């Protein structure tokens, strides 16, 4: 069906939500730009944590070292993935940017991977993909600017709530704490 008022196909896809299906949306491997999808990163029944953001997004950068600490802490039972998306504060935007990072809006995967490289120089050994230039995953996960998720066996277990910045990491840590506790007992 076509929308008379857009001329585009009619959307029938419900927005991502907890307890709903995790979109198997498209992403790009930085080395060689091969097409991949979010669920390619799920390892059997292990939860997969998704971390969307960019270098010019201050809350994303503010939590990176805490995120890396979560990887060390929970990697026994949980997998982690960073998705590098459109810049929050591009250097060539309308409003002037004071971000420590000076990155123009990506015009191609070569630009986006260049930006992601700046990130990867921190975050040694973290799994990282790029969103497609069509912003497939950002759109499917409502994850522009930045967002955190947990998915497990194709289902969204945790959707990072919009609201005061700071809480998203503590709320994710809470989810991971409770899962680890179910698996192994409370840590002393």
Swiss-Prot record:
Q: EC number(s) on record?
A: 1.21.99.3
User: Reaction catalysed by this chain?
Assistant: 3,3',5'-triiodo-L-thyronine + iodide + A + H(+) = L-thyroxine + AH2; 3,3'-diiodo-L-thyronine + iodide + A + H(+) = 3,3',5-triiodo-L-thyronine + AH2; 3-iodo-L-thyronine + iodide + A + H(+) = 3,5-diiodo-L-thyronine + AH2; L-thyronine + iodide + A + H(+) = 3-iodo-L-thyronine + AH2
Record-level GO cellular component terms = endosome membrane; plasma membrane
Kindly state a single biological-process term from the GO annotations of this entry: positive regulation of multicellular organism growth
Q: Does the keyword Cell membrane apply?
A: yes
The entry's function note states: Plays a crucial role in the metabolism of thyroid hormones (TH) and has specific roles in TH activation and inactivation by deiodination. Catalyzes the deiodination of L-thyroxine (T4) to 3,3',5'-triiodothyronine (rT3), 3,5,3'-triiodothyronine (T3) to 3,3'-diiodothyronine (3,3'-T2), 3,5-diiodothyronine (3,5-T2) to 3-monoiodothyronine (3-T1), rT3 to 3',5'-diiodothyronine (3',5'-T2) and 3,3'-T2 to 3'-monoiodothyronine (3'-T1) via inner-ring deiodination (IRD). Catalyzes the deiodination of 3-T1 to L-thyronine (T0) via outer-ring deiodination (ORD).
Which protein family is named in the record?
Belongs to the iodothyronine deiodinase family.
Q: What is this protein called?
A: Thyroxine 5-deiodinase
Q: Which organism is it from?
A: Mus musculus
């Amino acid at each position: 069906g076509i929308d008379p008022f857009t001329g585009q196909k009619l959307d029938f896809f419900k927005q991502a939500h907890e307890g709903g299906p995790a979109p198997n949306s498209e992403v790009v491997r930085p080395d060689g730009f091969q097409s991949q999808r979010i669920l390619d990163y799920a390892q059997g029944t292990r939860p997969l944590v998704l971390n969307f953001g960019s270098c010019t997004c201050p809350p994303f950068m503010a939590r990176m070292s805490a995120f890396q600490r979560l990887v060390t802490k929970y990697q026994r039972d949980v997998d982690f993935l960073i998705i590098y998306i459109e810049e929050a504060h591009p250097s060539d935007g309308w409003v002037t940017t004071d971000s420590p990072y000076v990155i123009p809006q990506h015009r191609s995967l070569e630009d986006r991977v260049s930006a992601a490289r700046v990130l990867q120089q921190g975050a040694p050994g973290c799994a990282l993909v790029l969103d497609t230039m069509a912003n497939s995953s950002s759109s499917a996960y409502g994850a522009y600017f930045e967002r955190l998720y947990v998915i497990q066996s194709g289902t969204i277990m945790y959707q990072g709530g919009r609201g005061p910045d700071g809480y998203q990491v503590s709320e994710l840590r809470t989810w991971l704490e409770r899962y680890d506790e179910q698996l192994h007992g409370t840590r002393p």
